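Dear V.,

Thank you for sending over the compound details. I've combined the ligand you provided, magnesium ion, with the protein sequence from our construct and run the structure prediction for the complex. I'm sharing the raw inputs here so there's no ambiguity about protonation or stereochemistry in the SMILES, which I know was a concern on your side last time.
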Amino acid sequence: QNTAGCGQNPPSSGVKSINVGGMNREYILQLPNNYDPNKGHMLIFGLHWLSGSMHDVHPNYYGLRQLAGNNAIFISPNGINNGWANDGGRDVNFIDAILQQVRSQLCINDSQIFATGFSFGGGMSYALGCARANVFRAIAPIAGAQISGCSGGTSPIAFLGIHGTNDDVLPIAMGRQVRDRFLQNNGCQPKNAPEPGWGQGPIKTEYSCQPNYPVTWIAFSGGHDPNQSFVGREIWDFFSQF
Ligand SMILES: *[C@@H]1O[C@H](CO)[C@@H](O[C@@H]2O[C@H](CO)[C@@H](O)[C@H](O)[C@H]2NC(C)=O)[C@H](O)[C@H]1NC(C)=O
Ligand SMILES: [Mg+2]
Ligand SMILES: [Mg+2]
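Below is the predicted structure of the protein with magnesium ion bound, written out as structure tokens.
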């Protein structure tokens, strides 16, 4: 169902400021080229990595911007200390604040809200899938790990995990642990997910789960780097299936 901001005169795209429990925080809002205020848009959060900032995820949003057409509104939130430590849920609360604001301003389809990010941003996407399975339709950690916490974490939510076999910063076992939680939550039949050899193309495993909560795992042969040609395409195809 569509939000109250449908039919409202839109704000400008750009850097936004927001008060989260007394803390001034910032995010980039990026509206589509053609913004129809009467069409319910996808809302896609892209979450940066440690030492990076919201200015690194904008303007390409992990390859999604080039493929999303006018279907999506993009958010690039800025982490405190250039990370997503999420102490006591403060970063989940930050996302709650953005959601409350943009849902009242923009035309969003509440069944099409998504989160993706690399490394620390993958941990934060995981933390949102754990605590906000009511809000998010799917998450897609890229080289993710349990580094932003996981409060709750028993509800099903559609999940796409992408990880490199040669990642020496967050080893792929850490990403499998994230994946394995939603294999359980989403009622997926156990199944071998092979992973590519050196110099071999990525291997996508699509698990058999409850058809509303699919799980997909894509292992590639590289390292701690989200800039693989397949990333934007695969995340877009996963998010746009709903
Ligand atoms: C909001 O998104 C939902 C889910 O993507 C849309 O509902 C789907 O619409 C397609 C085609 O119209 C159907 O094949 C699906 O079965 C629907 N799914 C669900 C869960 O309803 C919906 O049309 C979008 N727009 C609004 C205004 O709700
Ligand atoms: Mg990081
Ligand atoms: Mg379009």
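A first observation: Strands lie at 14-20, 23-30, 41-47, 72-77, 108-118, 138-142, 158-164, 203-206, 215-220.

Warm regards,
I. M.
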